[PDB]
Amino acid sequence: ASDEEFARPTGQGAEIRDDGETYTTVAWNATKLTEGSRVTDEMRDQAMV
Amino acid sequence: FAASDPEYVDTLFREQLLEVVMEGRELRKVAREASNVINANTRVGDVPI
Amino acid sequence: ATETQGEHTFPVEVLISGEELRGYTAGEALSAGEPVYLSGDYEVSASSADGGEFLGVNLYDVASGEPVALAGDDCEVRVEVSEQVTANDEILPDGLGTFETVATSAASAGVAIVQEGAASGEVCEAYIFAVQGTTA
Amino acid sequence: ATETQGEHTFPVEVLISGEELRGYTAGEALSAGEPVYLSGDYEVSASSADGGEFLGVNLYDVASGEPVALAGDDCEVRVEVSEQVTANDEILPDGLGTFETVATSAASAGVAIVQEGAASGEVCEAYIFAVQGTTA
Amino acid sequence: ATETQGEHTFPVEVLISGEELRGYTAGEALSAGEPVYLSGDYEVSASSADGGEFLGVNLYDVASGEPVALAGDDCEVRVEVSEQVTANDEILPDGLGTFETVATSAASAGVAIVQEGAASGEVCEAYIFAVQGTTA
Ligand SMILES: [K+]
Ligand SMILES: [Mg+2]
Ligand SMILES: [Mg+2]
Ligand SMILES: [Mg+2]
Numbered sequence: 001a002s003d004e005e006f007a008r009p010t011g012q013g014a015e016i017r018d019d020g021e022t023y024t025t026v027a028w029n030a031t032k033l034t035e036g037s038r039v040t041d042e043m044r045d046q047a048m049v
Numbered sequence: 050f051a052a053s054d055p056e057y058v059d060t061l062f063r064e065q066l067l068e069v070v071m072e073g074r075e076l077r078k079v080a081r082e083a084s085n086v087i088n089a090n091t092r093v094g095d096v097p098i
Numbered sequence: 099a100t101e102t103q104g105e106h107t108f109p110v111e112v113l114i115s116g117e118e119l120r121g122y123t124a125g126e127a128l129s130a131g132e133p134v135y136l137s138g139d140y141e142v143s144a145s146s147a148d149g150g151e152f153l154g155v156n157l158y159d160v161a162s163g164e165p166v167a168l169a170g171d172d173c174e175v176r177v178e179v180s181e182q183v184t185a186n187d188e189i190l191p192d193g194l195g196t197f198e199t200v201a202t203s204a205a206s207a208g209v210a211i212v213q214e215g216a217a218s219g220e221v222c223e224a225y226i227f228a229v230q231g232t233t234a
Numbered sequence: 235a236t237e238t239q240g241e242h243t244f245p246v247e248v249l250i251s252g253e254e255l256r257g258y259t260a261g262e263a264l265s266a267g268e269p270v271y272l273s274g275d276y277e278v279s280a281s282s283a284d285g286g287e288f289l290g291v292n293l294y295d296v297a298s299g300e301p302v303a304l305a306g307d308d309c310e311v312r313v314e315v316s317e318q319v320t321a322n323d324e325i326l327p328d329g330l331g332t333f334e335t336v337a338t339s340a341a342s343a344g345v346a347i348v349q350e351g352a353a354s355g356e357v358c359e360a361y362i363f364a365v366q367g368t369t370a
Numbered sequence: 371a372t373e374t375q376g377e378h379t380f381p382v383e384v385l386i387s388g389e390e391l392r393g394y395t396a397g398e399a400l401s402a403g404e405p406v407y408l409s410g411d412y413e414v415s416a417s418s419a420d421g422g423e424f425l426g427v428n429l430y431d432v433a434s435g436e437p438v439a440l441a442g443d444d445c446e447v448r449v450e451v452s453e454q455v456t457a458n459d460e461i462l463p464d465g466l467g468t469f470e471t472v473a474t475s476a477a478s479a480g481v482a483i484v485q486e487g488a489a490s491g492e493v494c495e496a497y498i499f500a501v502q503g504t505t506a
């Protein structure tokens with residue numbers, strides 16, 4: 001949304017004027033982050049952890 | 050002006066993408082009606098005549 | 099590469115078979131089916147002619163500095179050729195974003211083998227078997 | 235190739251290891267262990283001698299026009315040799331449905347490497363690492 | 371090959387990616403990341419210089435006669451070099467337990483492509499793509 005602005009001074013019985021909410025967008029473009037590891041079954045058995 | 054869809058066409062909503070994908074060229078499927086269909090037990094075989 | 103079907107243009111599926119799909123950074127803007135080589139550390143750019151510059155084909159369109167996927171060797175691929183290719187022709191990059199035959203280039207060995215022949219500017223089906231780099 | 239156990243004859247399995255098992259059309263009658271090249275569009279025939287003609291080895295016996303499974307590069311194969319092979323020898327098609335050494339052939343580069351040595355007419359264990367086609 | 375994190379030296383993980391991991395027997399005592407070739411039937415020893423002697427790299431330390439896991443072509447590997455390598459350099463065995471460039475060697479074709487450059491004595495990241503046996 002646009003910033004808050006200020007109402008306008010007006011005569012009596014006069015037309016109210018427009019300064020409605022104006023809009024824009026912020027983009028996102030997510031990047032894939034990856035991590036991998038491999039362990040042999042014999043390592044998995046033998047390790048203390 | 051005011052607020053109309055031509056201004057905020059990517060800002061306040063997305064253009065619809067239809068959930069239905071319309072077909073390419075479809076070729077005429079007939080063989081199952083246009084022939085006798087044999088559900089074989091084996092890749093190679095012979096039919097008695 | 100692209101495929102006309104009446105009023106429609108479709109993207110060509112670069113990858114026929116294989117799992118040699120590896121991550122790099124684009125050194126320039128790259129397009130799907132484009133041959134590439136290493137221009138920096140895990141950074142890939144469009145190949146030039148006459149060999150010594152091939153790692154794989156770019157799988158999808160990317161801008162400079164974006165993460166790219168490549169099909170490397172033991173992938174079967176759909177690629178665009180600058181000349182007529184028959185089956186069993188060895189091919190390598192032409193420097194134009196396309197492939198040419200070893201027979202046409204100044205190089206003596208290729209990087210892919212044509213399985214399905216194509217005319218100039220059309221899609222051949224080829225198998226990637228080698229990479230080529232700097233030998234001096 | 236075949237094996238005798240008393241009165242019984244058993245087929246040798248061509249594929250030791252590997253997963254580059256790819257589909258083609260036979261352009262002639264082909265036998266298990268037979269080296270082949272692209273004779274046409276996804277169509278394979280038995281390799282001649284002296285290189286420029288190799289895609290894989292035929293995994294099972296086929297008639298002309300039938301679909302064939304080839305072991306390509308990345309595959310360890312049981313294949314028949316016309317001469318004595320020692321380990322580390324590069325081998326390529328013989329032109330006789332068998333393999334010969336790069337040393338014996340007019341070619342300078344092979345398609346498979348011998349892992350288990352074998353005598354003339356026997357079965358070696360070899361690893362396919364390269365394909366060969368038309369370079370002019 | 372080894373990595374420094376403060377006072378600590380760590381064993382480098384030879385394998386970055388790939389599944390071309392194959393069993394041989396050690397013909398001698400071998401160290402991790404060492405280039406190797408076939409010295410006998412399913413038996414591998416450390417490569418000499420100038421080509422014709424490469425099957426893969428040794429994945430962990432073995433004594434003579436012990437079963438070796440070898441990374442072949444289709445593997446991304448962390449390997450030690452004897453000279454400065456840039457990305458896109460072709461490398462082959464040095465004879466010293468290391469890799470050198472094709473440019474430096476008396477050979478004219480390599481076995482791996484450098485993906486990340488390194489100085490003399492440092493660890494490059496490479497993709498193995500070829501095997502070299504004897505051609506006579
Ligand atoms: K390969
Ligand atoms: Mg008014
Ligand atoms: Mg305002
Ligand atoms: Mg019958």
Ligand SMILES: [Mg+2]
Nearest residue numbers: 117118119388
């Ligand atoms: Mg891979």
